Each structure stands twice: as structure tokens, then as C-alpha cells.
Tab-separated table of C-alpha atoms in Angstrom:
chain	number	residue	atom	x	y	z
A	1	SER	CA	39.983	-5.018	96.342
A	2	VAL	CA	39.496	-8.721	97.542
A	3	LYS	CA	40.604	-11.775	95.395
A	4	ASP	CA	37.582	-13.589	94.785
A	5	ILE	CA	35.378	-10.561	93.896
A	6	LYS	CA	37.585	-9.070	90.890
A	7	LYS	CA	37.144	-12.073	88.720
A	8	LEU	CA	33.343	-11.682	89.021
A	9	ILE	CA	33.421	-8.355	87.807
A	10	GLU	CA	35.708	-8.798	84.894
A	11	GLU	CA	33.021	-10.409	82.507
A	12	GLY	CA	30.640	-7.490	83.989
A	13	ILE	CA	31.838	-4.100	83.786
A	14	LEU	CA	35.803	-3.627	84.209
A	15	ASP	CA	38.364	-4.766	82.278
A	16	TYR	CA	42.274	-5.950	83.114
A	17	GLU	CA	43.944	-2.738	82.392
A	18	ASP	CA	42.310	-0.725	85.422
A	19	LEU	CA	43.800	-3.009	88.187
A	20	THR	CA	45.908	-1.874	90.603
A	21	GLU	CA	49.448	-3.493	91.161
A	22	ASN	CA	48.574	-4.895	94.491
A	23	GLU	CA	45.256	-6.300	92.702
A	24	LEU	CA	47.212	-7.868	89.841
A	25	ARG	CA	49.615	-9.149	92.289
A	26	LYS	CA	46.589	-10.560	94.427
A	27	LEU	CA	44.852	-12.268	91.630
A	28	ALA	CA	48.240	-14.330	90.441
A	29	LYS	CA	48.598	-15.478	94.150
A	30	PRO	CA	46.926	-18.831	94.635
A	31	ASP	CA	43.369	-18.973	96.057
A	32	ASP	CA	42.280	-20.264	99.634
A	33	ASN	CA	42.243	-23.784	98.307
A	34	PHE	CA	45.776	-23.291	98.714
A	35	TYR	CA	46.909	-24.104	102.168
A	36	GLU	CA	44.120	-26.270	102.833
A	37	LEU	CA	44.850	-29.937	103.253
A	38	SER	CA	43.737	-32.695	101.203
A	39	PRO	CA	46.111	-35.857	100.992
A	40	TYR	CA	44.361	-37.677	98.090
A	41	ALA	CA	45.408	-38.317	94.459
A	42	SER	CA	44.036	-40.730	91.897
A	43	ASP	CA	44.353	-42.282	88.526
A	44	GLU	CA	48.372	-42.850	88.442
A	45	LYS	CA	48.719	-43.100	84.958
A	46	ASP	CA	50.958	-40.369	83.769
A	47	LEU	CA	52.507	-39.865	80.633
A	48	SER	CA	55.720	-38.249	82.294
A	49	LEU	CA	57.325	-41.456	83.044
A	50	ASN	CA	58.347	-43.943	80.436
A	51	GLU	CA	58.141	-47.593	81.226
A	52	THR	CA	60.188	-48.380	78.056
A	53	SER	CA	63.279	-46.318	78.990
A	54	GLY	CA	66.819	-47.473	79.842
A	55	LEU	CA	70.260	-46.525	80.961
A	56	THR	CA	72.868	-44.891	78.511
A	57	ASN	CA	74.467	-47.938	76.798
A	58	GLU	CA	77.919	-45.783	76.673
A	59	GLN	CA	79.051	-48.493	73.975
A	60	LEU	CA	76.200	-47.618	71.669
A	61	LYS	CA	76.396	-44.021	72.593
A	62	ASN	CA	80.223	-44.452	71.439
A	63	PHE	CA	79.109	-46.242	68.150
A	64	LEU	CA	76.286	-43.698	67.493
A	65	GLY	CA	78.659	-40.603	67.921
A	66	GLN	CA	81.091	-41.924	65.276
A	67	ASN	CA	78.249	-41.747	62.527
A	68	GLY	CA	79.171	-45.274	61.450
A	69	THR	CA	76.635	-45.364	58.464
A	70	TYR	CA	74.384	-47.227	60.805
A	71	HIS	CA	70.677	-47.976	60.335
A	72	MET	CA	68.904	-47.686	63.588
A	73	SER	CA	69.936	-45.502	66.615
A	74	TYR	CA	67.943	-46.918	69.743
A	75	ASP	CA	68.040	-50.428	71.536
A	76	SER	CA	64.623	-51.663	70.535
A	77	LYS	CA	64.431	-54.434	72.955
A	78	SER	CA	62.334	-52.634	76.007
A	79	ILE	CA	60.368	-51.116	73.518
A	80	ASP	CA	59.481	-54.514	71.618
A	81	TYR	CA	59.024	-55.987	74.978
A	82	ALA	CA	56.283	-53.359	76.034
A	83	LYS	CA	54.571	-54.042	72.652
A	84	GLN	CA	54.458	-57.797	73.250
A	85	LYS	CA	53.223	-57.616	76.819
A	86	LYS	CA	50.274	-55.065	75.522
A	87	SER	CA	49.180	-58.115	73.258
A	88	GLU	CA	48.011	-60.049	76.307
A	89	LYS	CA	46.185	-57.403	78.662
A	90	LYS	CA	43.135	-57.632	77.145
A	91	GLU	CA	40.613	-55.673	75.532
A	92	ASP	CA	40.479	-54.347	78.646
A	93	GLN	CA	42.536	-51.121	77.689
A	94	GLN	CA	40.049	-49.414	76.090
A	95	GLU	CA	42.474	-47.851	73.830
A	96	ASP	CA	42.216	-44.422	72.537
A	97	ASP	CA	40.543	-42.791	75.472
A	98	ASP	CA	43.670	-42.850	77.252
A	99	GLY	CA	44.794	-41.831	73.969
A	100	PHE	CA	42.330	-38.910	73.931
A	101	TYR	CA	40.778	-38.802	77.302
A	102	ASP	CA	43.889	-38.781	79.041
A	103	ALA	CA	46.587	-37.901	76.908
A	104	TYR	CA	45.150	-34.378	75.935
A	105	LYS	CA	43.959	-33.552	79.033
A	106	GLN	CA	47.804	-34.195	80.448
A	107	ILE	CA	49.459	-32.582	77.307
A	108	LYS	CA	47.567	-29.103	78.216
A	109	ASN	CA	48.562	-29.374	81.806
A	110	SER	CA	52.376	-29.389	80.731
A	111	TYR	CA	51.530	-26.024	79.027
A	112	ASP	CA	50.456	-24.554	82.133
A	113	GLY	CA	53.203	-25.682	84.121
A	114	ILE	CA	51.097	-28.298	85.894
A	115	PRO	CA	51.887	-31.903	86.759
A	116	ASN	CA	49.791	-34.386	85.328
A	117	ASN	CA	47.831	-35.752	88.274
A	118	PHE	CA	48.211	-32.637	89.982
A	119	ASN	CA	45.035	-31.332	91.236
A	120	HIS	CA	45.993	-27.935	92.806
A	121	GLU	CA	47.298	-24.399	91.787
A	122	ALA	CA	50.699	-24.334	89.764
A	123	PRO	CA	53.177	-21.629	88.732
A	124	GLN	CA	54.276	-20.606	85.700
A	125	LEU	CA	56.727	-17.452	84.921
A	126	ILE	CA	54.841	-14.917	82.608
A	127	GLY	CA	57.232	-12.094	81.781
A	128	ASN	CA	59.067	-11.188	85.001
A	129	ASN	CA	56.537	-12.714	87.934
A	130	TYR	CA	54.824	-15.720	88.567
A	131	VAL	CA	50.947	-16.810	87.899
A	132	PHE	CA	49.497	-19.704	89.779
A	133	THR	CA	47.035	-21.466	87.679
A	134	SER	CA	45.336	-24.723	87.881
A	135	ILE	CA	43.248	-27.176	85.894
A	136	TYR	CA	40.008	-25.873	87.112
A	137	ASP	CA	40.824	-21.916	86.915
A	138	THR	CA	43.104	-21.832	83.979
A	139	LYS	CA	43.645	-17.775	84.370
A	140	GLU	CA	43.958	-17.542	80.726
A	141	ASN	CA	42.572	-13.879	80.285
A	142	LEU	CA	45.538	-12.917	82.853
A	143	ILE	CA	48.141	-14.830	80.681
A	144	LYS	CA	46.868	-12.763	77.630
A	145	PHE	CA	47.295	-9.959	79.888
A	146	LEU	CA	50.683	-10.345	81.356
A	147	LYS	CA	52.106	-11.499	78.109
A	148	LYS	CA	50.559	-8.680	75.689
A	149	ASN	CA	50.751	-5.896	77.695
A	150	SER	CA	53.797	-6.597	79.916
A	151	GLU	CA	56.299	-6.695	77.219
A	152	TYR	CA	57.865	-3.448	77.465
A	153	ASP	CA	57.141	-2.471	80.861
A	154	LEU	CA	57.201	-3.784	84.386
A	155	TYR	CA	54.299	-5.204	86.543
A	156	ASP	CA	54.225	-6.934	89.862
B	764	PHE	CA	27.377	-49.568	66.617
B	765	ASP	CA	29.297	-46.320	66.257
B	766	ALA	CA	28.614	-46.323	62.387
B	767	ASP	CA	26.090	-47.864	60.319
B	768	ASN	CA	25.300	-44.906	58.068
B	769	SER	CA	27.369	-46.484	55.493
B	770	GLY	CA	25.539	-48.791	53.170
B	771	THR	CA	28.982	-50.527	52.181
B	772	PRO	CA	29.147	-54.380	51.370
B	773	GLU	CA	31.665	-54.306	54.313
B	774	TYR	CA	28.393	-54.242	56.756
B	775	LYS	CA	26.636	-57.132	54.463
B	776	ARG	CA	29.920	-59.274	54.860
B	777	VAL	CA	29.770	-58.769	58.591
B	778	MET	CA	25.701	-58.908	58.620
B	779	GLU	CA	25.712	-62.262	57.003
B	780	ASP	CA	28.191	-63.549	59.282
B	781	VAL	CA	26.536	-62.842	62.316
B	782	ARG	CA	23.149	-63.973	60.960
B	783	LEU	CA	24.768	-67.548	60.454
B	784	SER	CA	26.555	-67.797	63.739
B	785	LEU	CA	22.928	-66.989	65.200
B	786	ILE	CA	21.524	-69.658	63.289
B	787	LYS	CA	24.151	-71.959	64.812
B	788	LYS	CA	23.203	-70.327	68.185
B	789	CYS	CA	19.546	-70.906	67.622
B	790	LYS	CA	20.353	-74.455	66.561
B	791	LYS	CA	22.281	-75.262	69.845
B	792	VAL	CA	20.181	-73.297	72.135
B	793	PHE	CA	16.446	-73.581	70.719
B	794	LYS	CA	16.500	-77.071	69.856
B	795	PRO	CA	17.312	-77.611	66.133
B	796	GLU	CA	14.113	-78.932	65.222
B	797	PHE	CA	12.883	-75.310	65.810
B	798	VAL	CA	15.207	-74.243	62.820
B	799	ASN	CA	13.508	-76.378	60.036
B	800	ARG	CA	10.193	-75.639	61.081
B	801	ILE	CA	10.588	-71.769	61.538
B	802	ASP	CA	10.288	-70.165	58.195
B	803	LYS	CA	12.565	-67.135	57.155
B	804	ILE	CA	14.718	-65.772	60.020
B	805	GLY	CA	15.741	-61.947	60.117
B	806	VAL	CA	18.198	-60.448	62.232
B	807	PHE	CA	17.314	-56.845	62.705
B	808	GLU	CA	19.950	-54.227	62.335
B	809	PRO	CA	21.507	-51.788	64.961
B	810	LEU	CA	19.621	-48.271	64.273
B	811	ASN	CA	21.574	-45.417	62.847
B	812	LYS	CA	20.679	-41.577	62.618
B	813	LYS	CA	19.304	-42.250	59.376
B	814	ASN	CA	16.531	-44.611	60.586
B	815	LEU	CA	16.395	-42.542	63.765
B	816	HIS	CA	15.285	-39.263	62.056
B	817	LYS	CA	12.084	-41.138	61.102
B	818	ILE	CA	11.614	-43.114	64.492
B	819	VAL	CA	11.590	-39.988	66.473
B	820	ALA	CA	9.490	-38.321	63.955
B	821	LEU	CA	6.467	-40.853	64.447
B	822	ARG	CA	6.801	-40.379	68.252
B	823	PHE	CA	5.300	-36.817	67.663
B	824	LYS	CA	2.424	-37.942	65.702
B	825	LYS	CA	1.716	-40.240	68.744
B	826	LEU	CA	2.473	-37.487	71.277
B	827	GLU	CA	-0.574	-35.690	69.247
B	828	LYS	CA	-2.557	-38.667	69.793
B	829	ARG	CA	-2.644	-39.008	73.465
B	830	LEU	CA	-3.339	-35.093	73.781
B	831	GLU	CA	-6.348	-35.165	71.811
B	832	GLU	CA	-8.346	-35.143	75.008
B	833	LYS	CA	-6.231	-31.584	75.423
B	834	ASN	CA	-5.721	-30.642	71.754
B	835	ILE	CA	-2.458	-29.557	72.044
B	836	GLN	CA	-0.339	-29.713	68.652
B	837	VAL	CA	3.052	-30.150	68.429
B	838	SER	CA	5.386	-29.993	65.318
B	839	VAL	CA	9.183	-30.309	65.480
B	840	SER	CA	11.971	-29.154	63.084
B	841	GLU	CA	14.462	-31.342	61.501
B	842	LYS	CA	17.055	-29.059	63.442
B	843	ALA	CA	15.310	-30.090	66.383
B	844	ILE	CA	15.525	-33.836	65.848
B	845	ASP	CA	19.146	-34.024	65.474
B	846	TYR	CA	19.619	-32.164	68.984
B	847	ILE	CA	17.465	-34.862	70.459
B	848	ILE	CA	19.671	-37.680	68.899
C	174	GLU	CA	66.955	-61.611	26.678
C	175	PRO	CA	68.261	-58.142	27.107
C	176	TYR	CA	69.272	-58.498	30.591
C	177	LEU	CA	70.930	-61.929	29.859
C	178	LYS	CA	73.712	-60.476	28.001
C	179	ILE	CA	74.945	-58.202	30.517
C	180	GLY	CA	75.655	-61.198	33.015
C	181	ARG	CA	77.877	-62.809	29.992
C	182	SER	CA	79.483	-59.769	29.047
C	183	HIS	CA	83.121	-59.394	30.727
C	184	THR	CA	82.341	-56.232	32.344
C	185	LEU	CA	83.596	-55.293	35.837
C	186	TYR	CA	80.870	-54.485	38.516
C	187	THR	CA	82.255	-50.982	38.911
C	188	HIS	CA	81.311	-50.321	35.260
C	189	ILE	CA	77.791	-51.388	35.793
C	190	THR	CA	75.928	-48.197	35.902
C	191	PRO	CA	72.519	-47.405	35.597
C	192	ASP	CA	72.760	-46.755	32.189
C	193	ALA	CA	73.938	-50.017	31.256
C	194	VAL	CA	71.087	-51.507	32.540
C	195	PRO	CA	68.201	-51.203	30.374
C	196	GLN	CA	64.976	-50.307	32.054
C	197	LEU	CA	61.794	-52.596	32.645
C	198	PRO	CA	58.951	-52.471	30.589
C	199	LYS	CA	56.318	-50.688	32.552
C	200	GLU	CA	54.435	-53.656	33.333
C	201	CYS	CA	57.098	-55.280	35.326
C	202	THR	CA	57.835	-52.098	37.542
C	203	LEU	CA	55.881	-52.686	40.715
C	204	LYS	CA	54.087	-49.474	40.046
C	205	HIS	CA	51.790	-51.142	37.354
C	206	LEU	CA	51.084	-54.392	39.605
C	207	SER	CA	50.727	-51.887	42.490
C	208	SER	CA	48.136	-49.985	40.431
C	209	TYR	CA	46.700	-53.294	39.308
C	210	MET	CA	45.941	-54.025	42.864
C	211	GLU	CA	44.044	-50.474	42.950
C	212	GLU	CA	41.855	-51.883	40.315
C	213	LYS	CA	41.788	-55.853	40.668
C	214	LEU	CA	40.293	-56.212	43.930
C	215	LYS	CA	38.736	-52.809	45.093
C	216	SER	CA	36.229	-52.688	41.955
C	217	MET	CA	35.915	-56.569	41.729
C	218	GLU	CA	35.416	-57.412	45.284
C	219	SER	CA	32.103	-55.457	45.456
C	220	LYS	CA	31.012	-56.950	42.595
C	221	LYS	CA	30.688	-60.146	44.667
C	222	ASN	CA	28.771	-58.540	47.359
C	223	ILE	CA	26.484	-56.783	45.048
C	224	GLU	CA	23.449	-59.023	43.418
C	225	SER	CA	24.050	-61.490	46.608
C	226	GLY	CA	20.820	-60.920	48.751
C	227	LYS	CA	18.002	-59.731	46.455
C	228	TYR	CA	17.010	-62.969	45.242
C	229	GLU	CA	14.214	-61.638	43.012
C	230	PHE	CA	13.039	-63.440	40.013
D	1	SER	CA	40.252	-19.194	37.946
D	2	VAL	CA	39.330	-20.992	40.943
D	3	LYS	CA	41.204	-24.214	42.362
D	4	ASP	CA	37.901	-26.395	42.625
D	5	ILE	CA	36.350	-25.552	39.357
D	6	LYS	CA	39.003	-26.423	36.892
D	7	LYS	CA	39.510	-30.135	37.529
D	8	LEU	CA	35.682	-30.457	36.454
D	9	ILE	CA	36.612	-28.885	33.274
D	10	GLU	CA	39.471	-31.144	32.437
D	11	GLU	CA	37.522	-34.026	31.385
D	12	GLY	CA	35.074	-32.090	29.630
D	13	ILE	CA	36.466	-29.206	27.309
D	14	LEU	CA	40.193	-27.744	28.065
D	15	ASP	CA	43.408	-29.672	28.353
D	16	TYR	CA	46.161	-29.221	30.859
D	17	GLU	CA	48.478	-27.241	28.507
D	18	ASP	CA	46.234	-24.018	28.109
D	19	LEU	CA	46.276	-23.229	32.216
D	20	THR	CA	47.992	-20.022	33.431
D	21	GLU	CA	51.015	-20.046	35.716
D	22	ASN	CA	48.764	-19.244	38.601
D	23	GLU	CA	46.588	-21.629	37.725
D	24	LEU	CA	48.778	-24.305	37.530
D	25	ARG	CA	50.572	-23.252	41.076
D	26	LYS	CA	47.030	-23.262	42.458
D	27	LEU	CA	46.170	-26.624	41.287
D	28	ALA	CA	49.358	-28.238	42.831
D	29	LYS	CA	48.629	-26.580	46.318
D	30	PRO	CA	46.616	-28.450	48.631
D	31	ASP	CA	42.665	-28.244	48.794
D	32	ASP	CA	40.606	-26.545	51.707
D	33	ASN	CA	40.438	-29.834	53.631
D	34	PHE	CA	44.195	-29.111	54.431
D	35	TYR	CA	44.247	-26.683	57.422
D	36	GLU	CA	40.862	-28.103	58.468
D	37	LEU	CA	41.605	-29.934	61.830
D	38	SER	CA	40.809	-33.692	62.008
D	39	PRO	CA	42.906	-35.309	64.843
D	40	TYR	CA	41.942	-39.062	64.167
D	41	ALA	CA	44.056	-42.008	62.575
D	42	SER	CA	43.431	-45.598	62.561
D	43	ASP	CA	44.733	-48.929	61.519
D	44	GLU	CA	48.385	-48.769	63.005
D	45	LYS	CA	49.911	-51.688	61.270
D	46	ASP	CA	52.384	-49.865	59.003
D	47	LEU	CA	54.923	-51.582	56.727
D	48	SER	CA	57.245	-48.858	57.442
D	49	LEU	CA	58.767	-50.078	60.672
D	50	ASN	CA	60.134	-53.599	60.996
D	51	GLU	CA	59.733	-55.215	64.394
D	52	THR	CA	62.329	-57.717	63.506
D	53	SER	CA	65.027	-55.228	63.401
D	54	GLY	CA	68.360	-54.725	65.474
D	55	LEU	CA	71.169	-52.876	66.169
D	56	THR	CA	74.426	-52.890	64.222
D	57	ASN	CA	76.747	-55.590	65.651
D	58	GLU	CA	79.750	-54.052	65.050
D	59	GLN	CA	81.774	-57.576	65.445
D	60	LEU	CA	79.525	-59.056	62.648
D	61	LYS	CA	79.869	-55.833	60.433
D	62	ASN	CA	83.699	-56.269	61.207
D	63	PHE	CA	83.428	-60.128	60.037
D	64	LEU	CA	81.184	-59.727	57.109
D	65	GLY	CA	83.174	-56.808	55.663
D	66	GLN	CA	86.527	-58.973	55.401
D	67	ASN	CA	84.493	-61.174	52.923
D	68	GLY	CA	85.615	-64.061	55.106
D	69	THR	CA	84.153	-66.821	52.796
D	70	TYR	CA	80.973	-66.977	54.701
D	71	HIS	CA	77.793	-68.558	54.413
D	72	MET	CA	75.211	-66.390	55.991
D	73	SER	CA	74.909	-62.478	56.371
D	74	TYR	CA	72.205	-61.239	58.783
D	75	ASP	CA	71.792	-62.444	62.453
D	76	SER	CA	68.456	-64.666	62.165
D	77	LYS	CA	67.429	-64.434	65.860
D	78	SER	CA	65.027	-61.884	65.811
D	79	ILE	CA	63.590	-62.799	62.443
D	80	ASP	CA	63.222	-66.667	63.755
D	81	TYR	CA	61.577	-65.163	66.934
D	82	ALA	CA	58.786	-63.296	65.058
D	83	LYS	CA	58.429	-66.683	63.034
D	84	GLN	CA	57.990	-68.731	66.127
D	85	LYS	CA	55.600	-66.265	67.834
D	86	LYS	CA	53.313	-65.993	64.463
D	87	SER	CA	52.808	-69.834	64.270
D	88	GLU	CA	51.747	-69.555	68.474
D	89	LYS	CA	48.554	-67.701	67.540
D	90	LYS	CA	47.964	-67.338	63.845
D	91	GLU	CA	47.147	-70.689	63.994
D	92	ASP	CA	44.659	-69.431	66.842
D	93	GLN	CA	42.838	-66.818	65.101
D	94	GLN	CA	43.632	-65.169	61.747
D	95	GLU	CA	42.007	-65.372	58.189
D	96	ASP	CA	44.722	-62.969	56.102
D	97	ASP	CA	43.377	-61.006	53.485
D	98	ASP	CA	45.778	-58.282	54.312
D	99	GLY	CA	48.938	-59.454	52.850
D	100	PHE	CA	46.410	-58.593	49.893
D	101	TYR	CA	44.742	-55.247	50.366
D	102	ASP	CA	47.029	-53.883	52.751
D	103	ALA	CA	50.483	-54.279	51.415
D	104	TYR	CA	49.857	-52.932	47.987
D	105	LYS	CA	47.982	-49.940	49.289
D	106	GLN	CA	50.845	-48.950	51.437
D	107	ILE	CA	53.478	-49.594	48.484
D	108	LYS	CA	51.473	-47.475	45.745
D	109	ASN	CA	51.336	-44.565	48.675
D	110	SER	CA	55.336	-44.887	48.690
D	111	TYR	CA	55.637	-43.853	45.286
D	112	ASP	CA	53.574	-40.790	46.080
D	113	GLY	CA	55.569	-39.632	48.601
D	114	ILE	CA	52.685	-40.321	51.082
D	115	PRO	CA	53.054	-42.113	54.528
D	116	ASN	CA	50.993	-45.342	55.378
D	117	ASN	CA	48.223	-44.154	57.594
D	118	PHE	CA	48.329	-40.667	56.150
D	119	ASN	CA	45.192	-39.603	55.313
D	120	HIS	CA	45.980	-36.119	53.935
D	121	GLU	CA	47.721	-34.356	51.220
D	122	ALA	CA	51.232	-35.233	50.533
D	123	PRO	CA	53.874	-33.382	48.728
D	124	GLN	CA	56.363	-35.026	45.791
D	125	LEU	CA	58.955	-33.047	43.980
D	126	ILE	CA	57.849	-33.122	40.305
D	127	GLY	CA	60.739	-31.258	38.217
D	128	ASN	CA	61.214	-28.079	40.030
D	129	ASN	CA	58.273	-27.627	41.955
D	130	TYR	CA	55.942	-29.616	44.376
D	131	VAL	CA	52.869	-31.292	43.788
D	132	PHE	CA	50.518	-31.947	46.959
D	133	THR	CA	48.740	-35.333	46.196
D	134	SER	CA	46.714	-37.826	48.591
D	135	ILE	CA	45.125	-40.993	48.599
D	136	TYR	CA	41.693	-39.861	47.202
D	137	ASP	CA	42.993	-37.388	44.702
D	138	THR	CA	45.949	-38.700	42.933
D	139	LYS	CA	46.615	-36.042	40.407
D	140	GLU	CA	47.742	-38.774	37.970
D	141	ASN	CA	47.145	-36.424	35.405
D	142	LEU	CA	48.793	-33.516	36.503
D	143	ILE	CA	52.026	-35.703	37.148
D	144	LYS	CA	51.918	-36.549	33.564
D	145	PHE	CA	51.797	-33.391	32.353
D	146	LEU	CA	54.429	-31.906	34.675
D	147	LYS	CA	57.103	-34.596	33.796
D	148	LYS	CA	56.538	-34.648	30.159
D	149	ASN	CA	56.257	-31.244	29.142
D	150	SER	CA	58.138	-29.588	31.921
D	151	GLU	CA	61.431	-31.476	30.686
D	152	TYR	CA	63.256	-28.765	29.007
D	153	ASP	CA	61.404	-25.643	30.258
D	154	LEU	CA	60.354	-24.367	33.460
D	155	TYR	CA	56.622	-24.080	34.970
D	156	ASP	CA	55.772	-22.752	38.793
């Protein structure tokens, strides 16, 4: 009957099918940590923005659109510029951790509708209603419930 | 460091190149008169799980020896060594 | 020798097809040489490093 | 009758002509290492992409097309730029050994339909059907079989 207690009983006794409509609505709303103020974020190396990106050329896009028997699509100036400046940063990169320890975490967050440095609870539309998930509580057993069982019928 | 379980000659190419550089490093720091006076010089390899399976194994024989006042025998499975590593 | 005759041959470039070109013998395609370099280093390279440091009489 | 056992008998007793249609189909499918997850690749120095490449100029291509009694075709700016930046550092730190041992490996992989850093099993159309080969098991005696004997008739 309370938001916090039901997920402690989901492993023990009761399943997901027997919850109330007001209990499924409450378990998909965010927790009490949402609305609690915490103005701090870290690790501003996001894979969302590309530093190599540039404007639409509008002359190349005219040339690539006419199919022109060409041999290269992109501009390759700013993406060779980023390759050259990477040569001198140092061994300080410690590569493939940002490749692995930080790429695969931010990819899995983008599957849950979560931004990359976003440490809080994030919505994603499942069927007809929204489910607020985060990095910490992924609510994966609810997403299995509201996709499978809620194909034909309606729940709020 | 991460991979030494190979017995490839690629390590032996690297193993000789770092030994010859430490000879130059001992020749500069450790007073090159020592170099021709000291006999055969060996660089020890960084250890791997093939060696470490036996290195952990001798320790439990030493654990029996310091428990001889207490007479507590200890024996360790081959699965248990790899979980410790 | 067979390739030299076609350059002297008074044909247009439009009539030079893959058929008119004789095939190279198999040594001359890169395939062979490429497969030669599967062998010629890879096996021979570790023959240099074996017997290097055993020293025994 | 099993995929793995037949190639151990190809050297010993039986040839390639006496296999079943379902055995030739199975021996050209990939092994069990395919579908097994292994997310790691190394040595990202591929000869597939050219860092010296640039866009179609569309004014030079207009000029080279009119046959113009000219003396040079390409642009030669980015390919002298790569020659200059090679001399600023190559003379600092490199012994090559890569022009030999990394060029000829990647060329032989491109005749088998394999990408350059691709450590897994790759298809190539031989006759009517596909044969999955890799770097490790080249399946060269099958390619001799399905090219020579399968000129006129059909096998799956």
C-alpha cells in the first residue's frame, strides 16, 4: 500500500499481476529522492555531443544529392583534425576504459531514456503510461510486466 | 603485465630488449666497473597465473608449519586457488 | 611476351575486354605473393628466436 | 555427421566428393564460436580507410574531364601533408616491421571477404552459395572443391 514496501515483497511472496491500479501507478512514479534538491553533477564527458560536427554545407549536400558518381560523402576535415590533436594529448587518455567503462554505461542509459550524466529518475513511455526509471533502480521487472501483459488491455 | 601466459618468442624479443637496456642502466647508475666484475645477470619475469598457481600452493604448506603448535591441517582445492587469484 | 603483342596490336581501347587480356600465371597475382607472406616470415620468423638462448653444448 | 568431426577425417580417409548435401551445407556454415559473445578488437590501423582522402572538387573533375592537355590529375595537397607530418615524427620514433607483416595480412583477408581487424568468420559467395571463412580456418580445400567441381552442377 506504500510505494517503498511493495518492491521488498516482490521477491518474497507476491507477483506483479495482483497489484492495484493505484499501486501500479505509484510504483511507476518517481521516489522521494525526486523533488529533493541536489545540485551537483560530474564527469562531463558525454557521448551525446560530437565535437567533430559541423554545419550543413549546402553545396556538398547539393552535390551529394545528385548522386554524381562520387567517392566520399562527409567532409573529413574536422574528423582528421580531431585525430591529429588526439595524437598529442598523451598516454593520459587510458583508452578503452572510456571505450568500455564509460561507453557501455551511457549506451545502456540511452535505452532507458536517461541522459548520460543524469543521476536521477527518468521517464520512458511503456504502452500507454510513463515509467520513471534511473541508473540505480532500473525497474526492469516492471518493464517486463507493462510490455508483455499490457499489449491488449489498459493499465494506469 | 596483463598477459604472460603465452610462451611466444614475441615475449622473448621484448625480454631481451629490456634486459639489454637495464645493462645500460646499470652501466650508467651502478658504476660500469661493477658490470664486468659481476657474473651472469638475470631479469626476473613478471609473474603469471601459471606460476601463481604454484606460488599460492607453497604458502599453505607454510601455513601448516606455523600452525604446528595448534595442529590445524589446511588443504586447498585447485578451484579455490583460482578464486584467490 | 604475350602482353607485349597487344600493345603493338592496332586495336581500339574499346575492344580491349578481359577476354583479350591473357591471365597472369598464378605466381604473378598478389594471391600467391600474399600467401607467400603467410609463409615466408611467420614460420621463418620464429625460427630465428628459437635456439637463441639455450646455449648448451 | 557432425560439423566438427568431418574436417578431422578429411586428412585421414575420406575426400570431399563423398559428403552429403547436408554435410557440405553444414561445413560452410560458421562454427559454434560464431554466436558466442566476445566484444574486443585491437590494432585499429586498417588499410581500408585512407586518411589522405578528400572530397570531389567538381571544378578539377570538370577540368580533368575535358582532357585539357594537363600534367597532373590528383590534388597533392593532403598527400604531401601526410608526407610532411610523417617526417616530423617517423625520424623520432619508429622501426617499421609493419609494412611487412601488417600489409600482406590485411591484403590476403580482403581476398577472403574479411575486414581488416575482423577476427571472426566471414562469408564469401562461391558459385551459388556462401562459405563462411575466417583468418584462423581459411577453408581453402572447400573453396577448391566448390569452385572446380561446382562449375556445371548445383550443390547447397
